[PDB]
């Protein structure tokens, strides 16, 4: 009978992290997804790596 309340407290804190994880994430990501885009140079890295495909695949 002992165990289940202990495990409940842990399990809730676990469940309570994931939700905070998605909601945290959602704000952080839904904020900064926007800003990134100024980097032209990831498309710098697209071409660069894209050359290391276009050249370096065959």
């Amino acid at each position: 009978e002992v165990k289940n309340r202990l495990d409940y407290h842990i399990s809730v804190q676990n469940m309570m992290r994931q939700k905070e994880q998605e909601h945290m994430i959602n704000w952080v990501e839904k904020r900064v997804v926007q800003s990134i885009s100024a980097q032209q140079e990831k498309e710098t890295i697209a071409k660069c790596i894209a050359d290391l495909k276009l050249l370096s695949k065959k």
Binding site: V2, K3, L6, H9, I10, Q13
Partner: protein, 121 residues
């Protein structure tokens, strides 16, 4: 708990010349069997708890400790005897059987066999 032990004896059952229990023994053995099976079923023990590691995985780790101490230090008392006259209200009624019925029964027997001998003669 922990409790010790006597096997079936059907001869016993029928005889109870304390008439007020004659039925009871037949039923009472079967009540026994209920316990007999039930005890054979279960084990004595659960495991226990590694509180140290569970404290690692409970962030409210105080709880694990608190309940730990109380539980581990605690021992609950074995469901306690109320009756032990069974042995006794018998073994005395077993004298009731013996001396009282022994003597009368053996003295009768002798007269029978005593006339037969001469009847074989």
């Amino acid at each position: 708990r922990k409790l010790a032990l006597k096997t079936i004896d059907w001869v016993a059952f029928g005889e109870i010349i304390p008439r007020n229990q004659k039925a009871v023994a037949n039923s009472l053995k079967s009540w026994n069997e209920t316990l007999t099976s039930r005890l054979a079923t279960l084990p004595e023990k659960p495991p226990a708890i590694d509180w140290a590691y569970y404290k690692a995985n409970v962030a409210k780790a105080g709880l694990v400790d608190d309940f730990e101490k109380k539980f581990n230090a605690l021992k609950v008392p074995i469901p306690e005897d109320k009756y032990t006259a069974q042995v006794d209200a018998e073994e005395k009624e077993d004298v009731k059987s013996c001396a009282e019925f022994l003597t009368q029964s053996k003295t009768r027997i002798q007269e029978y066999e005593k006339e037969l001998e001469k009847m074989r003669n």
